[PDB]
């Protein structure tokens, strides 16, 4: 029978009445999806900052954030302590389509984030003079219907991300995506509590009580949280999850996945970091 999540009530998107489940809601999900949704800003703004300075320093924190999630351990655990015990294990990409080596995680936990563009290497990120070129180096010319690599790694549609030179708002959003083979309320609550203790979010009102089961057939700026941030995954492409799992030879044809509520994170960066992150050749380039 399907897993009983007592505290979070279930919810269904395509048809499946629940008489209390006869209609496609039978087995365990292919995987649970956990989004750590990050909003970041260089809160004290100055003149003389270039458009790139809007996002380079916020993006530089993805590496420490990814390390925190992967090294997080639930002290005083009654069943699961670390992420390795709970996350989805992937082994090898398809034998063809190895061109995405060192851009998608090969061995270990399925964990996606912008840092994958630089192999989760802060030094490689620092030695990069044009973040936009690196980000777009593998997008198609709109000739491929599946989800693009940028969408897969960022977790957002792309216009919400704010990573562009014409960003008028100084708040940039991205996401870290975790695929979990098992559901553990204690561990997930521990991870959520840790992230909101480290990075409290301003009057964050995100919903936290519904798991969505999806079945696939066939001046100074301030960070705000609102209804536009609720269920952000719903604004990804339809083929997003099937294409993500197809890259690893996992099929969602007659089975479903379970998307959990997102964990909010808010990062405020100061001019000292915004400068220390700056690449020397962009100071005299424009």
């Amino acid at each position, epitope marked *: 029978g399907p897993v009983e999540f007592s505290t979070p009530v279930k919810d269904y998107f395509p048809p499946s009445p629940d008489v209390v489940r006869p209609d496609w809601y039978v087995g365990a999900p292919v995987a649970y999806i956990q989004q750590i949704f990050v909003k970041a800003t260089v809160s004290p703004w100055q003149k003389n900052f270039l458009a790139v300075d809007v996002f380079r320093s916020p993006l530089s924190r993805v590496f420490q954030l990814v390390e925190e999630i992967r090294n997080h351990a639930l002290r*005083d655990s*009654s*069943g699961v302590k670390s992420l390795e015990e709970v996350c989805l294990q992937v082994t090898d990409l398809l034998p063809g389509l190895k061109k995405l080596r060192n851009l998608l995680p090969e061995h270990g936990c399925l964990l996606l984030s912008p840092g994958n563009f630089w192999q989760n290497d802060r030094e490689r990120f620092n030695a990069d003079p044009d973040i936009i070129k690196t980000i777009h180096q593998h997008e198609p010319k709109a000739l491929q219907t599946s989800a693009t690599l940028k969408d897969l790694l960022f977790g957002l549609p792309g216009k919400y991300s704010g990573v562009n030179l014409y960003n008028r708002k100084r708040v940039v959003s991205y996401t870290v995506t975790l695929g979990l083979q098992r559901y553990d309320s*204690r561990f997930l609550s*521990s991870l959520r*509590s840790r992230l909101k203790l480290l990075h409290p979010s301003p009057n964050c009102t995100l919903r936290e009580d519904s798991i969505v089961h999806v079945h696939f057939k066939e001046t100074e700026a301030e960070v705000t949280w609102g209804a536009e941030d609720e269920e952000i995954w719903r604004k990804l492409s339809f083929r997003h999850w099937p294409s993500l799992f197809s890259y690893y030879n996992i099929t969602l044809a007659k089975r479903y996945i379970s998307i959990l509520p997102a964990i909010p994170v808010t990062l405020y960066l100061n001019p000292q970091e915004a400068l220390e992150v700056r690449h020397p050749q962009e100071a005299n380039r424009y």
Partner: antibody, heavy 120, light 108 residues
Framework: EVQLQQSGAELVRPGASVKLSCTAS????????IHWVKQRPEQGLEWIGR????????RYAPKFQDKATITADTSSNTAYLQLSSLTSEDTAVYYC?????????????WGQGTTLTVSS | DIQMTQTTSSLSASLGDRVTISCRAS??????LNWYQQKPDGTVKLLIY???RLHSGVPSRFSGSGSGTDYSLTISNLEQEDIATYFC?????????FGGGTKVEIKR
């Protein structure tokens, strides 16, 4: 709202065994750990152990290994602490509590406390 | 394993006075310090679970600060209801240890 009623004061002989009880109201013990703490005047609070009533998985401080035994009945929503091989050093106040945040691990709600005296 | 020590076991103050309790950990505890209040009746109540934060229902006159090994609770203006003992608990390494409480009393 949330209350943790404890049993009355207890008097027992040395070498005996006691079973203290802690009944929850306003919440289900399945949803949280239940902890026992020991207060002794002039020595300060100290942690005994905890139980996860959903799993029945207990853990103790190394001081009380082989001393304390924690159990829980979900139907009655009640946790229990059993003390064995009692001695004078066990005369103290025992608090039942829980926590609700699983990274901070703060004890949000406490019982009033049960005084246990061991004398012949 | 981790020993927490409060410098003063007693402290005398007056209504409306600025009060500060402090305690030190034997090793880094990574800001995992909670502050509890015990009344003379004996009932305990959480004040500052996390460094600097506040448990719901606690008056805003309570505050917390500190880092590394040294942490401090502060009462901006001592009220008559704030006569009690205060304990600091470390939740960093698994056997949680409390510090010997510090009592706060009025000036006799």
């Amino acid at each position: 709202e949330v209350q943790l009623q404890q049993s009355g004061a207890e008097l027992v002989r040395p070498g005996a065994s006691v079973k203290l009880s802690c009944t929850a109201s306003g919440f289900k013990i399945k949803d949280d750990y239940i902890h026992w703490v020991k207060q002794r005047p002039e020595q300060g609070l100290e942690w005994i152990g905890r139980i996860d009533p959903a799993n029945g998985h207990t853990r103790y401080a190394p001081k009380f290994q082989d001393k304390a035994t924690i159990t829980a009945d979900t139907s009655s929503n009640t946790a229990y602490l059993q003390l064995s091989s009692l001695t004078s050093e066990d005369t103290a106040v025992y608090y039942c509590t829980r926590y609700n945040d699983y990274d901070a691990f703060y004890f949000d709600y406490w019982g009033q406390g049960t005084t246990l005296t061991v004398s012949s | 394993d981790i020993q927490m020590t409060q410098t003063t076991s007693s402290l005398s103050a007056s209504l409306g006075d600025r009060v500060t309790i402090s305690c030190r950990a034997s090793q880094d505890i990574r800001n995992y310090l909670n502050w509890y209040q015990q009344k003379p009746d004996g009932t305990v109540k959480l004040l500052i679970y996390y460094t600097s934060r506040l448990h719901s229902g606690v008056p805003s006159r309570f505050s917390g600060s500190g880092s590394g090994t040294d942490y401090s609770l502060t009462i901006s203006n001592l009220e008559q209801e704030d006569i009690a003992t205060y304990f600091c608990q470390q939740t960093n390494t698994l056997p949680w240890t409390f510090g010997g409480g510090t009592k706060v009393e009025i000036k006799r």
